Amino acid sequence: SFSGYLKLTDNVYIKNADIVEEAKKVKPTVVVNAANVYLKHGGGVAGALNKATNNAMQVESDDYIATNGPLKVGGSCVLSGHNLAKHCLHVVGPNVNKGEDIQLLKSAYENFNQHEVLLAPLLSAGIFGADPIHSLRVCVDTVRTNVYLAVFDKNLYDKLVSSF
């Protein structure tokens, strides 16, 4: 199971950890990917999860987009978790560096409520340009299911916990 997490609320937990390493250790039912609408897993969390699958996540993702078209910002899709989890929930948070509306961050976190328990990153943080403190607050105020957040930066983890 999940270990070494700090409990923030009745249902939100947080740890300073690499989500790829956490997925390989736990093999959760659901791992969330910080996806873009095209499912092009080039960098950040998406690039790291895809590299751990030996590119099998990208091959599956390109077939999904060829059939269905792109996702919406704030939307999601369920695909295989490959060697990392039973399933991967690909969720698109708004990328502020592309001028996407930050209000769509709450819609993105609502996708988590369709799963009883998930391993996830903070949406729209990092190269998506949003304030991580804001992302954690939207997470706690929107997600009702059990979410285990992996934040791979000790300095940011300490700032998130000390300001919570």
Interface residues with ligand A1AK2 (CB under 6 A) are 18-20, 34, 44-45, 48, 121-122, 125-128, 132, 150-153, 156
Residue type, 159: K
| Cα separation, 37 vs 35, whole angstroms | 7
SS3 6: strand
**Least distance from C-beta 33 to ligand A1AK2, angstroms?**
9
**Least distance from C-beta 158 to ligand A1AK2, angstroms?**
13
**For residues 118 and 151, which CB has a smaller minimum distance to ligand A1AK2 in the complex?**
151
**Least distance from C-beta 133 to ligand A1AK2, angstroms?**
11
For the beta carbon of residue 111, count every other beta carbon within 10 angstroms: 23
**For residues 44 and 146, which CB has a smaller minimum distance to ligand A1AK2 in the complex?**
44
**Least distance from C-beta 29 to ligand A1AK2, angstroms?**
19
Q: Which residue has the tokens 């960098």?
A: 43
Residues in the chain: 164
DSSP state of 97: G
**For residues 39 and 150, which CB has a smaller minimum distance to ligand A1AK2 in the complex?**
150
**For residues 18 and 110, which CB has a smaller minimum distance to ligand A1AK2 in the complex?**
18
Burial group, residue 159, by CB count within 10 angstroms (0-12, 13-18, 19+): middle
